[PDB]
Design a protein around this ligand. Structure first.
Ligand SMILES: NCc1ccc(Cl)cc1CNC(=O)[C@@H]1CCCN1C(=O)[C@H](N)CC1CCCCC1
Ligand SMILES: CC(=O)N[C@@H]1[C@@H](O)[C@H](O)[C@@H](CO)O[C@H]1O
Ligand code: NA
Ligand code: NA
Lengths: 251, 11, 31
């Protein structure tokens, strides 16, 4: 996260770290959506241009964390993966369209003060909140700068959703309805973005109607990090919710 | 860089 | 979960985090 701040304890209790077993390293962010299901970006698991194609036994999830590198004894919980599900129309060849994946845990995780699921939006909450200018929150343990370094604890940044024409005009990549973009414009002064290692983490909004947190996006892609005139692009969770529900219902 | 995690999670 | 999106150390205790108001102030519809 570029130009963010240290998270408060328990501020993002749905935060998940995707952790490679060997070598032991951070792979991505993710989010807890129930006691058995974790949501992430497909490119965290499958990205052939970078020779990335993980199987379940390559990975662990670490839930309840705050420190990036510490083993947070009596606080974090580490879970093994039963199965990965990647969207069948995930487009890793062109533009990361449908950049979404689910991971089912081998065993349910116990909720605590530090471990708790985020809601997924329904159609009405998405329509109400996914509007240009409305701010969401991105969290992660990724890089603090595009070029460097890395944070001691989970980082947080609040960013406004951007008008679709501005998103389109900021890039040569073909944008789709399964993406939205967020970030400040050069003229707005404030800044901030996700960066490498924040992939797969959540873009959340707090509904002013029922005071619950909803995951509206998944950290997906950006040209650099926090560059003037660029924006971060996020998987549109509601647009892909029918797939989410089909997977969870079936498996 | 990362603190070792209990071996039970790697088995 | 029927309890989704309500944080134990914040919403459950009626405590606010240091920047959630910035989000609320940006939600300029329905108010
Ligand atoms: N830049 C870090 C970053 C910044 C913001 C956000 Cl939201 C996510 C992220 C993290 N996300 C990534 O690194 C992803 C992983 C794969 C490449 N990538 C990028 O973002 C490529 N630069 C552009 C792709 C190239 C592929 C076509 C779509 C465009
Ligand atoms: C697009 C691509 O390369 N997909 C492969 C898949 O065919 C293979 O089964 C898996 C390893 O089991 O690794 C990944
Ligand atoms: Na364009
Ligand atoms: Na920018």
């Amino acid at each position: 996260i570029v130009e963010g701040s240290d998270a408060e304890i328990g501020m993002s209790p749905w935060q998940v770290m995707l952790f490679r077993k060997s070598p032991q390293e951070l792979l991505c962010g993710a989010s807890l959506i129930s006691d058995r299901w974790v949501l992430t970006a497909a490119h965290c698991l499958l990205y052939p241009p970078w020779d990335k194609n993980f199987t379940e036994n390559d990975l662990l999830v670490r839930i309840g964390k705050h420190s990036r590198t510490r083993y947070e004894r009596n606080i974090e919980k580490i879970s093994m993966l039963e199965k990965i599900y990647i969207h069948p129309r995930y487009n890793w060849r062109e533009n990361l369209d449908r950049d979404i994946a689910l991971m089912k845990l081998k065993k349910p995780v116990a909720f605590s003060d530090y471990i708790h699921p985020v809601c997924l939006p329904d159609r009405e909450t998405a329509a109400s909140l996914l509007q240009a200018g409305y701010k969401g929150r991105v969290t992660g343990w990724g890089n603090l700068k595009e070029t460097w370094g890395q944070p001691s604890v989970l980082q947080v940044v609040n960013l406004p959703i951007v008008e679709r024409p501005v998103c389109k005009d900021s890039t040569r990549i073909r944008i789709t309805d399964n993406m939205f973009c967020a970030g400040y414009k050069p003229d707005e002064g404030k800044r901030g973005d996700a960066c490498e290692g924040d992939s797969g983490g959540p873009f959340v909004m707090k509904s002013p109607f029922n005071n619950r947190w909803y995951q509206m996006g998944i950290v997906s892609w950006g040209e650099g990090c926090d560059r003037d005139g660029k924006y971060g692009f996020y998987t549109h969770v509601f647009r892909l919710k029918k797939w989410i529900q089909k997977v969870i219902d079936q498996f | 860089d990362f603190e070792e995690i209990p071996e039970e999670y790697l088995q | 979960e029927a309890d989704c999106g309500l944080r134990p150390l914040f919403e459950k205790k009626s405590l606010e985090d240091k920047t959630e108001r910035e989000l609320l102030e940006s939600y300029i519809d329905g108010r």
